[PDB]
Amino acid sequence: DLSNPEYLYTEDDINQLLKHYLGLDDRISIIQHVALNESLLLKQTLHQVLSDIFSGMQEKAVIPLHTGNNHWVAMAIKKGMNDDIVISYNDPMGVSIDDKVTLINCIKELCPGAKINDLQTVQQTNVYDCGPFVVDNLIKMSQGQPILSTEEAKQQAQNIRQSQVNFLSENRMITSAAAALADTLLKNNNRITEGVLVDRIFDNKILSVQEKQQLLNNLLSLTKESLTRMLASTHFVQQQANVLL
């Protein structure tokens, strides 16, 4: 339950937040699934990121790293000045990157020239706030902005959680309202044409003229996923999710 002050962020929660905050720059790679207990996948993941930076197709990567006991840590990897690769890291419990032997071995193998920037800053004050701090760290470290100090962290923990969870709640409700409208418009189809979508909007017996004409307007080869995404950007679907409060 997102309203619970002790809610543990999931992988999807962090992905949704990082996409929301950073996603307008397509040169930032947002990595979803990486865990220290999966060494082969970790090395594959870091190598892909380093190859995308080498080629110039990506400038930076933000990586929510899953450690022991469902703990989350923040790693960012960017092109530095000159020809440097900069690895910035912060564990919200203040534990050194050096404690993470697997990760240090991986990095030494793939990029032994990398500049390691372990901020080593205790931030969390309970067993539940890794998620909020990893998100706030990844956003700031990505742009070479200073992360919250131990004192600011203590002062801001509930505020940064509340701001992030407000988005998560809105995101979930808008997406649920968009997916339900998408289901009524798709009927027995997995995919529809623009023409069939418009037919289905004109024929719909529940929407009103304003909502149907705001819809075609707000809209200015379509799947459940792409139509859901479209409907989620529409003002009147956002209105319905806002009432669901």
Residue numbers in the entry: 6 to 225, 234 to 258
Reproduce text from the manuscript describing this model.
Here we report biochemical and structural data on the DUB domain of O. tsutsugamushi OTT_1962, hereafter called OtDUB. Primary sequence analysis revealed conservation of a DUB-like catalytic triad (His76, Asp96, Cys135) and Trp77, suggesting that the Ulp1-like domain is catalytically active and not an acetyltransferase, respectively. OtDUB preferentially cleaves ubiquitin chains having at least three ubiquitins and efficiently cleaves both K48- and K63-linked chains, unlike other members of this clan that prefer K63 chains. In summary, we have uncovered a unique DUB from the obligate intracellular pathogen O. tsutsugamushi that is capable of efficiently cleaving long ubiquitin chains of different linkages and binding ubiquitin with extraordinary affinity.
We cloned the N-terminal domain of OtDUB from genomic DNA of the O. tsutsugamushi Ikeda isolate and included residues past the putative DUB domain (1–311) to examine a potential accessory domain that could modulate DUB activity. We determined the crystal structure of the apo-enzyme at 2.0 Å resolution, which revealed that the Ulp1-like domain of OtDUB has the predicted core fold of cysteine endopeptidase (CE)-clan proteases. OtDUB lacks an N-terminal VR-1; instead, the C-terminal accessory domain (residues 170–259) protrudes into the VR-1 position via an extended α-helical arm positioned close to the catalytic site, suggesting that it assists in substrate binding. The C-terminal region of the protein fragment, residues 260–311, was apparently disordered and not observed in the structure. When compared to the phylogenetically closest structure, RickCE from Rickettsia bellii, we observed structural conservation of only one VR: the small loop in VR-3. Besides lacking the N-terminal VR-1 present in RickCE, VR-2 of OtDUB comprises a loop and two short α-helices, while RickCE VR-2 is a large helical arm largely absent in OtDUB. These large structural differences between the two DUBs, and other prokaryotic CE-clan structures, are obvious when aligned, yet the core protease fold is conserved (Cα root-mean-square deviation (RMSD) 1.2–3.9 Å). A substantial structural transition of the UBD was supported by the apo-DUB-UBD1–311 crystal structure, which lacked density for residues 224–235 at the beginning of the UBD, a region that includes the ubiquitin-interacting residues D226 and K230.
